[PDB]
Amino acid sequence: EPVYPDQLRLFSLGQGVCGDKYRPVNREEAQSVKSNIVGMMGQWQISGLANGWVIMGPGYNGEIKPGTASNTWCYPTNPVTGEIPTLSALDIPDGDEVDVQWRLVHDSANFIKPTSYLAHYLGYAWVGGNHSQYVGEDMDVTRDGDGWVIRGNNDGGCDGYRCGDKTAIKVSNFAYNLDPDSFKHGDVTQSDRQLVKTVVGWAVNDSDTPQSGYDVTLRYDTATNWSKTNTYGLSEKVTTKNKFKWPLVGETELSIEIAANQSWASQNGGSTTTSLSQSVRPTVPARSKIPVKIELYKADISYPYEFKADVSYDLTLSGFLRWGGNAWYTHPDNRPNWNHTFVIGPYKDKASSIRYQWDKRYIPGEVKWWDWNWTIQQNGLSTMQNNLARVLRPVRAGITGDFSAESQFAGNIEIGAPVPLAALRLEIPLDAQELSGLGFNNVSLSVTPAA
Amino acid sequence: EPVYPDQLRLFSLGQGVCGDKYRPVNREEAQSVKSNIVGMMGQWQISGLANGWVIMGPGYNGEIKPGTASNTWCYPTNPVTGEIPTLSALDIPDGDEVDVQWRLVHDSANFIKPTSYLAHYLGYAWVGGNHSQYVGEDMDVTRDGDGWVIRGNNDGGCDGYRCGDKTAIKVSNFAYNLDPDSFKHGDVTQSDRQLVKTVVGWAVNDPQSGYDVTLRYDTATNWSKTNTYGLSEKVTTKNKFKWPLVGETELSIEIAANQSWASQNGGSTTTSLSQSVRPTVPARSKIPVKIELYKADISYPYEFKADVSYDLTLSGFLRWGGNAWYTHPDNRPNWNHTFVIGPYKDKASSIRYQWDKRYIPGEVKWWDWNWTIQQNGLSTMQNNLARVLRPVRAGITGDFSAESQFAGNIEIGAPVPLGLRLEIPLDAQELSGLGFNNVSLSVTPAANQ
């Protein structure tokens, strides 16, 4: 009887006060799911647990100690139990799209068999080839344009009511979305940052009043030349839901950002200039001067990358339903040639959600498609949780190629030892031509009052 | 203006009503930090935003659409601004502990400089060497204990009151904690699932349901792991985990917490399992039972990542002109302070704690972070503390290899014409010689589920 973190709910109604039909989480329970609770709190957040214990945000390392808080962590008084476990992702090696789909759809233990038992458990009939006594065995997997249709092999003759009527299981509408957080990289091949030039000069205090309260700002326009390779072809059908900057690797800063909904393969590189502005707030004593140095660099990186693209697809089960064993909510006995489709992946609507239909299986007005509590009493809760955990298992594909970028940047503005004015104003020269040629454009040194 | 997900807060006070000094987040702000809001929400949770909009739990895909809710995501009307960035981790290849400490502490751009500058902004004196006029230059790094010390070179002579008293930055108390979720492996060198035997039988009935055929047995794994270098006798995990699944050769290895990675290189672990089915045996009929037993061994090169954390002790005297010590001691005292760069230990040692709680006078008892900002300007201090606090992690690599004996599911077949009788042959002596110990089949009735 485990505490399920997705059912925790946090209320702001004072000490140990939880909403209605909710009760406070205790220390032993917060302990068994600490990583989960803390990961759902603000950095320096502090929320209450039962009996005067508190759990602190991640910035405090998620410590649980005696305390009091105005907001509490609450757990249902009537939790929904038996959640579908969530197994580890099934990683399929990169390749062109039919090799990736192909590899998935022919996997007996991780696909063919688990989806067959599903069509079987829900009441569909003849879910297996006629050269076997077990479900999901001896199945012919054929192509169907964009889709794949797995259907029991019919070679020969069968015996049973409409036994020559095998349930078809068809896979379609495949989509691949890249998870930017999945970034990883092989050995950094090319790598280095050459100091191409170092600008030095002075900042002078021609006054009897010491100066402070002025910022010395530097601004340049540098370019970033980057390029990337796509080893296989899936690359052309995969996309990102929302843009992201290419990850920092090395010390070498770069500003490259990938676009959403535009195929990975179409984004292979380019040159992009940027406007950067370095700055310092010096303090030069009266009738004195301080030295200012600025180190300019060129850098480059080369390394093999790898991101993961999750796969989702529509799963249609079509065939007639059994007599005296059907999971549909109305429970037909007339053997209707039923046709239903679940979406394995991100949510779309309630009808195609096993998880949604399964977690709501007790709100009477919710059960309008399949009768999940029916399947449970027929088969048993574990049987069903292991069946749905495998059919719902996360499937990810590797996306790879090579990465290479090159850029020029300036370190910060560094000041020296104030020295007695010789026998704020800047005496630091810039040769716009030489820097344009070193890859630095529009470089300017401004002086502005602090604020 | 920037929204900071660490300042979001959720209230449950009716529709669009936030707690005091807080205001509802609007669809255009929630959108920008979606990933974070959603990550903070229950599976099918729905939370309100500003102007009749709503954000849906991760189960509904985290979608923001017009709606209404009696719980709201609020943000401060008064937000702490200028948070210190967070850069991506800095990776140090595997080597011996002294090599991994060396690669960190000697890096000028990523360590001698940011750290020297921190000491310099806090008012510490003579944070450079006699051969240079800039901060963090001409410094010496030297072994001392199982820690090191950075301090300006004192050869030559100098200019300045007590200028021969350089500030020393001492790094020690290194710790390395392994992060399980960093698992990665090379080319899997060996993989193969072979069918050893298949117990077959007949669930016999002379219908009958509410019965569960239960198969209880013993799995077994043999493994070994190597450890390319030595850091490994120092790396540990705060939590015990379960070695990752790769391939489809089921394993059952548990890496214990608080032990050197190198004192856990292999073994043999048995673990009993229960397989169960609920048959619906027609009257006077026989249903077939099949159980496949297998053998597989996997073996590949691995690599995990350990978070390196250490203590930073600044020792030297504070300047009269101005230091950041909250009481601004004008008598140039000898100052000693140490920050813990890693998991939070206490407020005195947390730059971030102190920095994020800088506007709350009650809290300012160590360094005055508002003073440094005024003195040097806000983007300088936050770009400096981001390099001082940038996560650093070392790789732990080596070769792994395992073999196990697991059993597929007990599958039933179509029932054929003929207290539930189970005709299923099992010679425990044979299964034992084959590697399966304690195999047995049973029938117990059903009352729940």
In order of their start, the domains of chain B are 1-89 (3.10.40.10), 90-175+307-393 (3.30.412.10), 176-306+394-449 (2.170.15.10)
Q: Which DSSP symbol is given to B42? A: -
Chain B closest CA to A197's CA: distance in Å? Answer: 17
The alpha carbon dihedral of A371, A375, A376, A382 has a sign of negative
A154 φ/ψ sector (left φ>0, alpha ψ -120 to 50, else beta) = alpha
DSSP output for B394-434 = EEEEEEEEEEEEEEEEEEEB--EE---EEE----HHHHHHT
**Tokens in use for A360?**
């709501």
Contact B277, A383 (CB under 8 A): yes
Note the Cα B287 to chain centre separation in Å.
49
Best residue in B4, B74, B133 for a mutation probing chain A (most A CBs within 10 Å): B133
For residue B357, the chain A residues in CB contact (below 8 A) are 44
Give CA–CA dist A134/A171, Å, rounded. Answer: 22
Spatial neighbors of B161 by CB under 8 A, at least 6 apart, are none
Give CA–CA dist A255/A149, Å, rounded. Answer: 45
B274 by DSSP, 3-state: which? strand
For residue A87, report the phi and psi dihedrals to the nearest 5 degrees: -65, 170
What resolution in angstroms does the PDB record give? Answer: 2.8
CB contact under 8 A, B6 and A44: yes
Q: Is B449 on the interface with A (CB under 8 A)?
A: yes
B264 by DSSP, 3-state: which? coil
Q: Which residues pair with A321 in a beta bridge?
A: A124
Spatial neighbors of A265 by CB under 8 A, at least 6 apart, are A230, A233, A235, A236, A238
Cα distances (angstroms) measured from residue B271 to each of B65, B239, B252, B404: 49, 21, 8, 11
Chain B closest CA to A246's CA: distance in Å? Answer: 11
Chain A, residues 398-437, CB within 8 A of chain B, namely 412, 414-417
CB contact under 8 A, A414 and B276: no
Best residue in B344, B387, B392, B443 for a mutation probing chain A (most A CBs within 10 Å): B344
Chain A closest CA to B134's CA: distance in Å? Answer: 5
Burial of B49 (0-12, 13-18, 19+ CB in 10 A): buried
Contact A414, A279 (CB under 8 A): no
DSSP output for A377-400 = HHH-HHHHHHHHHHHH--EEEEEE
Q: Is B42 on the interface with A (CB under 8 A)?
A: yes
CB contact under 8 A, A19 and B12: yes
Chain A, residues 109-138, CB within 8 A of chain B, namely 109-110, 133-135
Q: Which residues pair with A409 in a beta bridge?
A: A297
Spatial neighbors of A370 by CB under 8 A, at least 6 apart, are A122, A327, A328, A329, A340, A357
Residue A62: how many CB atoms within 10 A of its CB? 18
Note the Cα B187 to chain centre separation in Å.
25
Counted residue by residue, chain A has a size of 451
Give CA–CA dist B156/A441, Å, rounded. Answer: 41
Spatial neighbors of A198 by CB under 8 A, at least 6 apart, are A293, A294, A295, A296
Q: Which residues pair with A414 in a beta bridge?
A: A293
CA angle B7, B12, B18 (to 5 degrees): 50
Solving technique? X-ray
**Tokens in use for A219?**
């601004």
Burial of A176 (0-12, 13-18, 19+ CB in 10 A): buried
Q: Which DSSP symbol is given to A373? A: H
**Tokens in use for A361?**
């299986």
Of A41, A61, A386, which has the smallest distance from its Cβ to B344's Cβ?
Answer: A61
CB contact under 8 A, B5 and A42: yes
Contact B32, B21 (CB under 8 A): no
Residue B352: how many CB atoms within 10 A of its CB? 16
Give CA–CA dist A257/B347, Å, rounded. Answer: 37
Contact A264, A238 (CB under 8 A): yes
CB contact under 8 A, A247 and B9: no
**Tokens in use for B41?**
């929400």
* Nearest one of A337, A322, A417, A432 to A378, comparing CA atoms: A322
For residue A156, report the phi and psi dihedrals to the nearest 5 degrees: 115, -140
Counted residue by residue, chain B has a size of 449
CB contact under 8 A, B375 and A325: no
Give CA–CA dist B151/A220, Å, rounded. Answer: 34
* Nearest one of A136, A139, A108 to A124, comparing CA atoms: A136
**Tokens in use for B224?**
């070994």
Of A88, A293, A379, which has the smallest distance from its Cβ to B278's Cβ?
Answer: A379
For residue A56, report the phi and psi dihedrals to the nearest 5 degrees: -105, 155
Note the Cα A244 to chain centre separation in Å.
11
Q: Which residues pair with B166 in a beta bridge?
A: none
Contact A440, A220 (CB under 8 A): yes
